[PDB]
C-alpha cells in the first residue's frame, strides 16, 4: 500500500535522525569504554550481575536494521549502557565515572532529539 510505504519512509527518516544522535552520544565516550559488549571471556560472571547487557555496537546493529520504532526505545538502550555500568562498577572507578560523564553530556543531545522527533513528527 501507499500507507505502508509512507510509514516506511518515516521509519527511515527516524533511523537517519537516531544515527546522528548515536554518533553524537558515542563522541561523549572518547575512551571507548562503551563501544563494544563486555567480554564474557574476560568477565565470565557478568550475566550473573547484569541481565540485559548493552553497548554502542549492539545499538548500531539494531539501528541499521531499523529496529528502533520510536526515540523511547533508543533511549531505553542508552540508559542500559549507563545503568549497567553504574551497578557493576564501584563509584571510585574509571568505568563508573565514564558513565556519569556520558549520562550528563548525553542529556543535552537527547533533550533536543526529543524536540526534533515531536517537531518533524
Swiss-Prot record:
Q: Where is the Bromo domain?
A: 9-113
Q: Which organism is it from?
A: Homo sapiens
Per its database record, what is this protein's job? Scaffold subunit of various histone acetyltransferase (HAT) complexes, such as the MOZ/MORF and HBO1 complexes, that acts as a regulator of hematopoiesis. Plays a key role in HBO1 complex by directing KAT7/HBO1 specificity towards histone H3 'Lys-14' acetylation (H3K14ac), thereby promoting erythroid differentiation.
Placement of covalent cross-link Glycyl lysine isopeptide (Lys-Gly) (interchain with G-Cter in SUMO2): 41
Q: Write down what this protein is called.
A: Bromodomain-containing protein 1
Q: How does it assemble?
A: Component of some HBO1 complex composed of KAT7/HBO1, MEAF6, ING4 and BRD1/BRPF2. Component of the MOZ/MORF complex composed at least of ING5, KAT6A, KAT6B, MEAF6 and one of BRPF1, BRD1/BRPF2 and BRPF3. Interacts (via PHD-type zinc finger domain) with unmodified histone H3. Interacts (via PWWP domain) with dimethylated and trimethylated 'Lys-79' on histone H3.
> What gene name is given for the protein in this entry?
BRD1
Which compartments does it reside in? Nucleus; Chromosome
Q: In which tissues is it expressed?
A: Highly expressed in testis.
Amino acid at each position: 500500500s501507499m500507507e505502508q510505504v509512507a510509514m516506511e519512509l518515516r521509519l527511515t527518516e527516524l533511523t537517519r535522525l537516531l544515527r546522528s544522535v548515536l554518533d553524537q552520544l558515542q563522541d561523549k565516550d572518547p575512551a571507548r569504554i562503551f563501544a563494544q559488549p563486555v567480554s564474557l571471556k574476560e568477565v565470565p560472571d557478568y550475566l550473573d550481575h547484569i541481565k540485559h547487557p548493552m553497548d554502542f555496537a549492539t545499538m548500531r546493529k539494531r539501528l541499521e536494521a531499523q529496529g528502533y520504532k520510536n526515540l523511547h526505545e533508543f533511549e531505553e538502550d542508552f540508559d542500559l549502557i549507563i545503568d549497567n555500568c553504574m551497578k557493576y562498577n564501584a563509584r571510585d572507578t574509571v568505568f563508573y565515572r565514564a558513565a556519569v560523564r556520558l549520562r550528563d553530556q548525553g542529556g543535552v543531545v537527547l533533550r533536543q532529539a526529543r524536540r526534533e522527533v515531536d517537531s518533524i513528527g
